[PDB]
Amino acid sequence: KAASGTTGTYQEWKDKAQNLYQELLTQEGQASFQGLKDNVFDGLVRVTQEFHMKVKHLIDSLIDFLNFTTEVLRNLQDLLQFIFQLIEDNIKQLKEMKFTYLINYIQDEINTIFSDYIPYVFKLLKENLCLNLHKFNEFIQNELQEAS
Amino acid sequence: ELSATAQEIIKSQAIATKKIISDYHQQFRYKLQDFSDQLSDYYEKFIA
């Protein structure tokens, strides 16, 4: 009974293992993460806009609270709004220039290099060895002639 | 394959496991019979 149950459970779970293998292949392809980056950038933009509104409201309320300085506070409000706009622009840029591409690029580069460039380097070493040996022979022949 | 191998191994073990006990129980009984027979002639051997 124990053996039967164990075999049944293993065969049951074999399928999800292959599903996870497919998911891993997709991840190595780097094709399921960019969406999360876009979502987080959108959330960041939304939160930045909300905080922009809250901060300007706070400054406006503070002016009246103090009156219950003014020009400086208004200029500070304008500058803070400018900084908020800069932050929003930077977030939009970061969303535009996502980093997901270079990971797959380097993965492909290493996969190609291992199977392509390494044998060529070995061949370079072999050729250099033979060439240096032959040059050694030439130079020793010349030196021996001079010694004789 | 592993499950089948394990099942056949345990099946092979079980028969010999039973066989040993089956062999030993009958001799266990025959020993009691022999001892009971022995007790009968103790007094006569002693006296003789």
Coordinates of N, CA and C in Angstrom, one line a residue:
Chain A
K1 N 0.8 -1.2 0.0 CA 0.0 0.0 0.0 C 0.9 1.3 0.0
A2 N 1.9 1.3 0.8 CA 2.8 2.4 0.9 C 3.4 2.7 -0.5
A3 N 3.9 1.6 -1.1 CA 4.6 1.8 -2.4 C 3.6 2.3 -3.5
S4 N 2.4 1.8 -3.5 CA 1.4 2.3 -4.4 C 1.1 3.7 -4.2
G5 N 0.9 4.1 -3.0 CA 0.6 5.5 -2.7 C 1.7 6.5 -3.1
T6 N 3.0 6.1 -2.8 CA 4.1 6.9 -3.1 C 4.2 7.1 -4.7
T7 N 4.1 6.0 -5.4 CA 4.1 6.1 -6.9 C 3.0 7.0 -7.4
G8 N 1.8 6.8 -6.9 CA 0.7 7.7 -7.3 C 1.0 9.1 -7.1
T9 N 1.5 9.5 -5.9 CA 1.7 10.9 -5.6 C 2.8 11.4 -6.5
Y10 N 3.9 10.7 -6.7 CA 5.0 11.1 -7.6 C 4.5 11.4 -9.0
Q11 N 3.7 10.4 -9.5 CA 3.2 10.6 -10.9 C 2.2 11.8 -10.9
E12 N 1.5 12.0 -9.9 CA 0.6 13.2 -9.8 C 1.4 14.5 -9.9
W13 N 2.5 14.6 -9.1 CA 3.3 15.8 -9.1 C 4.3 16.0 -10.2
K14 N 4.5 14.9 -11.1 CA 5.4 15.1 -12.2 C 4.9 16.2 -13.1
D15 N 3.6 16.4 -13.3 CA 3.1 17.4 -14.3 C 3.4 18.8 -13.9
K16 N 3.2 19.2 -12.6 CA 3.5 20.5 -12.2 C 5.0 20.8 -12.3
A17 N 5.8 19.8 -12.1 CA 7.2 20.0 -12.3 C 7.5 20.4 -13.8
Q18 N 6.9 19.8 -14.8 CA 7.1 20.2 -16.1 C 6.5 21.6 -16.4
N19 N 5.4 21.9 -15.8 CA 4.8 23.3 -15.9 C 5.8 24.3 -15.4
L20 N 6.5 24.0 -14.2 CA 7.5 24.8 -13.7 C 8.7 24.9 -14.6
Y21 N 9.0 23.8 -15.2 CA 10.1 23.8 -16.2 C 9.8 24.8 -17.3
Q22 N 8.6 24.8 -17.9 CA 8.2 25.7 -18.9 C 8.3 27.2 -18.4
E23 N 7.8 27.4 -17.2 CA 7.9 28.7 -16.6 C 9.4 29.2 -16.4
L24 N 10.2 28.3 -16.0 CA 11.7 28.6 -15.9 C 12.3 28.9 -17.2
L25 N 11.9 28.2 -18.3 CA 12.4 28.5 -19.6 C 11.9 29.9 -20.0
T26 N 10.6 30.3 -19.7 CA 10.1 31.6 -20.0 C 10.9 32.7 -19.2
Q27 N 11.2 32.4 -17.9 CA 12.0 33.3 -17.1 C 13.4 33.6 -17.7
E28 N 14.0 32.5 -18.1 CA 15.4 32.6 -18.7 C 15.3 33.4 -20.0
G29 N 14.2 33.3 -20.7 CA 13.9 34.1 -21.9 C 13.7 35.6 -21.5
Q30 N 13.4 35.8 -20.2 CA 13.1 37.2 -19.7 C 11.9 37.8 -20.5
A31 N 10.8 37.2 -20.3 CA 9.6 37.7 -21.1 C 8.3 37.8 -20.1
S32 N 8.5 37.7 -18.8 CA 7.4 37.8 -17.9 C 7.6 38.8 -16.8
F33 N 8.7 39.6 -16.8 CA 9.0 40.5 -15.8 C 8.8 42.0 -16.2
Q34 N 8.9 42.3 -17.4 CA 8.7 43.7 -17.9 C 7.4 44.3 -17.5
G35 N 6.3 43.4 -17.5 CA 5.0 43.9 -17.1 C 5.0 44.4 -15.6
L36 N 5.6 43.7 -14.8 CA 5.7 44.1 -13.4 C 6.4 45.5 -13.3
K37 N 7.5 45.7 -14.0 CA 8.1 47.0 -14.1 C 7.2 48.1 -14.5
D38 N 6.4 47.8 -15.6 CA 5.5 48.8 -16.0 C 4.4 49.1 -15.0
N39 N 3.9 48.1 -14.3 CA 2.9 48.3 -13.2 C 3.5 49.1 -12.1
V40 N 4.7 48.8 -11.7 CA 5.3 49.5 -10.5 C 5.6 51.0 -11.0
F41 N 6.0 51.2 -12.2 CA 6.2 52.6 -12.7 C 4.9 53.4 -12.7
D42 N 3.8 52.7 -13.2 CA 2.5 53.4 -13.2 C 2.1 53.7 -11.7
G43 N 2.2 52.8 -10.8 CA 1.9 53.1 -9.4 C 2.8 54.2 -8.8
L44 N 4.0 54.2 -9.2 CA 4.9 55.3 -8.7 C 4.4 56.7 -9.3
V45 N 4.1 56.7 -10.5 CA 3.6 58.0 -11.1 C 2.3 58.4 -10.4
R46 N 1.4 57.5 -10.1 CA 0.1 57.8 -9.4 C 0.4 58.4 -8.0
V47 N 1.3 57.7 -7.3 CA 1.6 58.1 -5.9 C 2.3 59.5 -6.0
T48 N 3.2 59.7 -7.0 CA 3.9 61.0 -7.1 C 2.9 62.1 -7.3
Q49 N 1.9 61.9 -8.2 CA 0.9 62.9 -8.4 C 0.1 63.2 -7.2
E50 N -0.3 62.1 -6.5 CA -1.1 62.3 -5.2 C -0.3 63.1 -4.2
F51 N 0.9 62.8 -4.0 CA 1.8 63.5 -3.1 C 2.0 64.9 -3.5
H52 N 2.2 65.1 -4.8 CA 2.2 66.5 -5.3 C 1.0 67.3 -4.9
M53 N -0.2 66.8 -5.1 CA -1.4 67.5 -4.6 C -1.4 67.7 -3.1
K54 N -1.0 66.7 -2.4 CA -1.1 66.8 -0.9 C -0.1 67.9 -0.4
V55 N 1.1 67.9 -1.0 CA 2.1 68.9 -0.6 C 1.7 70.3 -0.9
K56 N 1.2 70.5 -2.1 CA 0.8 71.9 -2.5 C -0.4 72.3 -1.6
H57 N -1.3 71.4 -1.3 CA -2.4 71.7 -0.4 C -1.9 72.1 1.0
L58 N -0.9 71.3 1.5 CA -0.3 71.6 2.8 C 0.4 73.0 2.8
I59 N 1.1 73.4 1.8 CA 1.7 74.7 1.7 C 0.6 75.8 1.7
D60 N -0.4 75.6 0.9 CA -1.5 76.6 0.8 C -2.1 76.8 2.2
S61 N -2.4 75.7 2.9 CA -3.0 75.7 4.2 C -2.1 76.4 5.2
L62 N -0.8 76.1 5.1 CA 0.2 76.7 6.1 C 0.2 78.2 5.9
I63 N 0.1 78.7 4.7 CA 0.1 80.2 4.5 C -1.0 80.8 5.3
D64 N -2.2 80.3 5.2 CA -3.3 80.9 5.9 C -3.2 80.7 7.4
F65 N -2.6 79.5 7.8 CA -2.4 79.2 9.2 C -1.4 80.3 9.8
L66 N -0.4 80.6 9.1 CA 0.6 81.6 9.6 C -0.1 83.0 9.6
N67 N -1.0 83.3 8.6 CA -1.6 84.6 8.6 C -2.7 84.7 9.7
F68 N -3.2 83.6 10.2 CA -4.4 83.6 11.1 C -4.2 84.4 12.4
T69 N 7.5 85.9 4.4 CA 7.1 84.5 4.5 C 6.1 84.1 3.4
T70 N 5.2 84.9 3.1 CA 4.2 84.5 2.1 C 4.8 84.3 0.7
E71 N 5.6 85.2 0.2 CA 6.2 85.1 -1.1 C 7.2 83.9 -1.1
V72 N 8.0 83.8 0.0 CA 8.9 82.7 0.0 C 8.2 81.3 0.0
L73 N 7.1 81.2 0.7 CA 6.3 80.0 0.7 C 5.7 79.7 -0.6
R74 N 5.2 80.7 -1.3 CA 4.7 80.5 -2.7 C 5.8 80.1 -3.6
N75 N 6.9 80.7 -3.6 CA 8.0 80.3 -4.4 C 8.5 78.8 -4.1
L76 N 8.5 78.5 -2.8 CA 8.8 77.1 -2.4 C 7.8 76.1 -3.0
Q77 N 6.5 76.5 -2.9 CA 5.4 75.7 -3.5 C 5.7 75.5 -5.0
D78 N 6.0 76.5 -5.7 CA 6.3 76.4 -7.2 C 7.5 75.5 -7.4
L79 N 8.6 75.7 -6.6 CA 9.8 74.9 -6.8 C 9.5 73.4 -6.5
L80 N 8.7 73.1 -5.4 CA 8.3 71.7 -5.1 C 7.5 71.1 -6.2
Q81 N 6.6 71.9 -6.8 CA 5.8 71.4 -8.0 C 6.8 71.1 -9.1
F82 N 7.8 71.9 -9.4 CA 8.7 71.7 -10.4 C 9.5 70.4 -10.2
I83 N 9.9 70.2 -8.9 CA 10.6 69.0 -8.6 C 9.7 67.7 -8.8
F84 N 8.5 67.9 -8.4 CA 7.5 66.8 -8.6 C 7.4 66.4 -10.1
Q85 N 7.3 67.5 -11.0 CA 7.3 67.2 -12.4 C 8.6 66.5 -12.9
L86 N 9.7 67.0 -12.4 CA 11.0 66.3 -12.7 C 10.9 64.8 -12.3
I87 N 10.4 64.5 -11.1 CA 10.4 63.2 -10.7 C 9.5 62.3 -11.6
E88 N 8.3 62.9 -11.9 CA 7.4 62.2 -12.8 C 8.1 61.9 -14.2
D89 N 8.8 62.9 -14.7 CA 9.5 62.7 -16.0 C 10.5 61.6 -15.8
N90 N 11.3 61.6 -14.7 CA 12.3 60.5 -14.5 C 11.6 59.2 -14.4
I91 N 10.5 59.1 -13.7 CA 9.8 57.8 -13.6 C 9.3 57.3 -15.0
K92 N 8.8 58.2 -15.8 CA 8.4 57.9 -17.2 C 9.6 57.4 -18.0
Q93 N 10.7 58.1 -17.9 CA 11.9 57.7 -18.5 C 12.3 56.3 -18.1
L94 N 12.4 56.0 -16.8 CA 12.8 54.7 -16.3 C 11.9 53.6 -16.9
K95 N 10.6 53.9 -17.0 CA 9.7 53.0 -17.6 C 10.0 52.8 -19.1
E96 N 10.4 53.9 -19.8 CA 10.7 53.7 -21.2 C 12.0 52.9 -21.4
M97 N 13.1 53.2 -20.7 CA 14.4 52.5 -20.8 C 14.5 51.4 -19.8
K98 N 13.6 50.3 -19.9 CA 13.7 49.2 -19.0 C 15.0 48.4 -19.2
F99 N 15.4 47.7 -18.2 CA 16.7 47.0 -18.2 C 16.5 45.5 -18.5
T100 N 15.3 45.0 -18.8 CA 15.0 43.6 -19.1 C 15.8 43.1 -20.3
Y101 N 16.1 43.9 -21.2 CA 16.6 43.5 -22.5 C 18.1 43.0 -22.4
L102 N 18.9 43.7 -21.6 CA 20.3 43.4 -21.6 C 20.6 42.1 -20.9
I103 N 19.7 41.7 -20.0 CA 19.8 40.4 -19.3 C 19.7 39.3 -20.3
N104 N 18.7 39.3 -21.1 CA 18.6 38.2 -22.2 C 19.7 38.4 -23.2
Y105 N 20.1 39.6 -23.5 CA 21.2 39.8 -24.4 C 22.5 39.1 -23.9
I106 N 22.8 39.3 -22.6 CA 24.0 38.7 -22.1 C 23.9 37.2 -21.9
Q107 N 22.7 36.7 -21.6 CA 22.5 35.3 -21.6 C 22.8 34.7 -23.0
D108 N 22.2 35.2 -24.0 CA 22.5 34.7 -25.4 C 24.0 34.8 -25.7
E109 N 24.6 36.0 -25.3 CA 26.0 36.2 -25.6 C 26.9 35.1 -24.9
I110 N 26.6 34.8 -23.7 CA 27.4 33.7 -23.0 C 27.1 32.4 -23.6
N111 N 25.9 32.1 -23.9 CA 25.5 30.8 -24.5 C 26.3 30.6 -25.8
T112 N 26.3 31.7 -26.6 CA 27.1 31.6 -27.9 C 28.6 31.5 -27.7
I113 N 29.1 32.3 -26.7 CA 30.5 32.3 -26.6 C 31.1 31.0 -26.1
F114 N 30.4 30.3 -25.2 CA 30.9 29.0 -24.7 C 31.1 28.1 -25.8
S115 N 30.1 27.9 -26.7 CA 30.1 26.9 -27.7 C 30.9 27.4 -29.0
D116 N 31.2 28.7 -29.1 CA 31.9 29.2 -30.3 C 33.3 29.7 -30.1
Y117 N 33.5 30.6 -29.2 CA 34.8 31.2 -29.0 C 35.9 30.4 -28.3
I118 N 35.4 29.5 -27.4 CA 36.4 28.7 -26.6 C 37.2 27.8 -27.5
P119 N 36.7 27.0 -28.4 CA 37.5 26.2 -29.3 C 38.5 27.1 -30.1
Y120 N 38.1 28.2 -30.5 CA 39.0 29.1 -31.3 C 40.1 29.6 -30.5
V121 N 39.9 29.9 -29.2 CA 41.0 30.2 -28.3 C 42.0 29.0 -28.1
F122 N 41.4 27.8 -28.0 CA 42.3 26.7 -27.9 C 43.1 26.5 -29.2
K123 N 42.5 26.7 -30.3 CA 43.2 26.6 -31.6 C 44.3 27.7 -31.7
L124 N 44.0 28.9 -31.2 CA 45.1 30.0 -31.1 C 46.2 29.5 -30.3
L125 N 46.0 28.9 -29.1 CA 47.0 28.4 -28.3 C 47.9 27.4 -29.0
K126 N 47.2 26.4 -29.6 CA 47.9 25.3 -30.3 C 48.8 25.9 -31.4
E127 N 48.3 26.8 -32.2 CA 49.0 27.4 -33.3 C 50.2 28.2 -32.8
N128 N 50.0 29.0 -31.7 CA 51.1 29.7 -31.1 C 52.2 28.8 -30.6
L129 N 51.8 27.7 -30.0 CA 52.8 26.7 -29.5 C 53.6 26.2 -30.6
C130 N 53.0 25.7 -31.7 CA 53.8 25.2 -32.8 C 54.7 26.2 -33.4
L131 N 54.2 27.4 -33.6 CA 55.0 28.5 -34.2 C 56.2 28.8 -33.4
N132 N 56.0 28.9 -32.0 CA 57.1 29.2 -31.2 C 58.1 28.1 -31.2
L133 N 57.7 26.8 -31.2 CA 58.6 25.7 -31.3 C 59.5 25.8 -32.5
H134 N 58.8 26.1 -33.7 CA 59.6 26.2 -34.9 C 60.6 27.3 -34.9
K135 N 60.2 28.5 -34.4 CA 61.1 29.6 -34.2 C 62.2 29.3 -33.3
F136 N 62.0 28.6 -32.2 CA 63.0 28.1 -31.4 C 64.0 27.3 -32.1
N137 N 63.5 26.4 -33.0 CA 64.4 25.5 -33.8 C 65.3 26.4 -34.7
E138 N 64.7 27.4 -35.4 CA 65.5 28.3 -36.2 C 66.6 29.0 -35.5
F139 N 66.2 29.6 -34.3 CA 67.2 30.4 -33.6 C 68.3 29.5 -33.1
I140 N 68.0 28.3 -32.5 CA 69.1 27.5 -32.1 C 70.0 27.0 -33.2
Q141 N 69.4 26.8 -34.4 CA 70.2 26.4 -35.5 C 71.2 27.5 -35.8
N142 N 70.7 28.8 -35.9 CA 71.6 29.9 -36.1 C 72.7 30.0 -35.1
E143 N 72.3 29.9 -33.8 CA 73.3 30.0 -32.7 C 74.3 28.9 -32.8
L144 N 73.9 27.7 -33.1 CA 74.9 26.6 -33.2 C 75.8 26.8 -34.3
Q145 N 75.3 27.3 -35.5 CA 76.2 27.7 -36.6 C 77.3 28.7 -36.1
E146 N 76.8 29.7 -35.4 CA 77.8 30.7 -35.0 C 78.8 30.1 -34.0
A147 N 78.3 29.3 -33.1 CA 79.3 28.6 -32.1 C 80.3 27.8 -32.8
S148 N 79.8 27.0 -33.8 CA 80.7 26.1 -34.6 C 81.8 27.0 -35.3
Chain B
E1 N 9.5 1.1 -12.1 CA 10.4 0.0 -12.0 C 10.9 -0.3 -10.6
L2 N 11.2 0.8 -9.8 CA 11.6 0.7 -8.5 C 10.5 0.1 -7.6
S3 N 9.3 0.6 -7.8 CA 8.2 0.0 -7.0 C 8.0 -1.5 -7.2
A4 N 8.1 -1.9 -8.5 CA 7.9 -3.3 -8.8 C 9.1 -4.1 -8.2
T5 N 10.3 -3.6 -8.3 CA 11.4 -4.3 -7.7 C 11.3 -4.4 -6.2
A6 N 10.9 -3.4 -5.5 CA 10.7 -3.4 -4.0 C 9.6 -4.4 -3.7
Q7 N 8.5 -4.4 -4.4 CA 7.4 -5.3 -4.1 C 7.8 -6.8 -4.3
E8 N 8.5 -7.1 -5.3 CA 9.0 -8.5 -5.5 C 10.0 -8.9 -4.5
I9 N 10.9 -7.9 -4.1 CA 11.8 -8.2 -3.0 C 11.1 -8.6 -1.7
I10 N 10.1 -7.8 -1.3 CA 9.4 -8.1 -0.1 C 8.7 -9.4 -0.2
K11 N 8.1 -9.7 -1.3 CA 7.4 -10.9 -1.5 C 8.4 -12.1 -1.4
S12 N 9.6 -12.0 -1.9 CA 10.5 -13.0 -1.8 C 10.9 -13.2 -0.4
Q13 N 11.1 -12.2 0.4 CA 11.5 -12.3 1.8 C 10.5 -13.0 2.6
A14 N 9.2 -12.7 2.4 CA 8.1 -13.2 3.3 C 8.1 -14.7 3.3
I15 N 8.2 -15.3 2.2 CA 8.1 -16.8 2.2 C 9.1 -17.5 3.0
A16 N 10.4 -17.1 2.9 CA 11.4 -17.7 3.7 C 11.2 -17.3 5.2
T17 N 10.8 -16.1 5.5 CA 10.5 -15.7 6.9 C 9.5 -16.7 7.5
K18 N 8.4 -17.0 6.8 CA 7.4 -17.9 7.3 C 8.0 -19.3 7.4
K19 N 8.9 -19.7 6.4 CA 9.4 -21.1 6.3 C 10.2 -21.4 7.5
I20 N 11.0 -20.5 8.0 CA 11.9 -20.8 9.2 C 11.0 -21.1 10.4
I21 N 10.0 -20.3 10.7 CA 9.2 -20.6 11.8 C 8.4 -21.9 11.7
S22 N 7.9 -22.2 10.5 CA 7.2 -23.4 10.2 C 8.1 -24.6 10.5
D23 N 9.4 -24.5 10.1 CA 10.4 -25.6 10.4 C 10.6 -25.7 11.9
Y24 N 10.7 -24.6 12.6 CA 11.1 -24.7 14.0 C 10.0 -25.2 14.9
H25 N 8.8 -24.8 14.7 CA 7.7 -25.1 15.6 C 7.5 -26.6 15.8
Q26 N 7.6 -27.4 14.8 CA 7.4 -28.9 14.9 C 8.4 -29.5 15.8
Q27 N 9.7 -29.1 15.6 CA 10.8 -29.6 16.4 C 10.6 -29.1 17.9
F28 N 10.1 -27.9 18.1 CA 9.8 -27.5 19.4 C 8.8 -28.5 20.1
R29 N 7.8 -28.9 19.4 CA 6.8 -29.8 19.9 C 7.4 -31.2 20.2
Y30 N 8.2 -31.7 19.2 CA 8.8 -33.0 19.3 C 9.8 -33.0 20.5
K31 N 10.4 -31.9 20.9 CA 11.3 -31.9 22.1 C 10.4 -32.1 23.3
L32 N 9.3 -31.4 23.4 CA 8.4 -31.7 24.6 C 8.0 -33.1 24.7
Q33 N 7.6 -33.7 23.5 CA 7.3 -35.2 23.5 C 8.5 -36.0 24.0
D34 N 9.7 -35.7 23.5 CA 10.8 -36.5 24.0 C 11.1 -36.4 25.5
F35 N 11.0 -35.1 26.0 CA 11.2 -34.9 27.4 C 10.1 -35.7 28.2
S36 N 8.9 -35.6 27.8 CA 7.8 -36.3 28.5 C 8.1 -37.8 28.6
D37 N 8.5 -38.3 27.4 CA 8.9 -39.8 27.4 C 10.0 -40.1 28.3
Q38 N 11.0 -39.2 28.4 CA 12.2 -39.4 29.2 C 11.8 -39.5 30.7
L39 N 10.9 -38.7 31.2 CA 10.6 -38.7 32.6 C 10.1 -40.0 33.1
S40 N 9.5 -40.8 32.2 CA 8.8 -42.1 32.6 C 9.8 -43.0 33.3
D41 N 11.0 -43.2 32.7 CA 11.9 -44.2 33.2 C 13.0 -43.7 34.2
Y42 N 12.8 -42.5 34.7 CA 13.8 -41.9 35.6 C 13.9 -42.8 36.9
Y43 N 12.8 -43.1 37.5 CA 12.8 -43.9 38.8 C 13.5 -45.2 38.5
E44 N 13.1 -45.9 37.4 CA 13.6 -47.2 37.2 C 15.1 -47.2 36.9
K45 N 15.6 -46.3 36.1 CA 17.0 -46.2 35.9 C 17.7 -45.9 37.2
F46 N 17.2 -45.0 38.0 CA 17.8 -44.7 39.3 C 18.0 -46.0 40.2
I47 N 16.8 -46.7 40.4 CA 16.8 -47.9 41.2 C 17.8 -48.9 40.7
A48 N 17.7 -49.2 39.3 CA 18.5 -50.2 38.7 C 20.0 -49.9 38.9

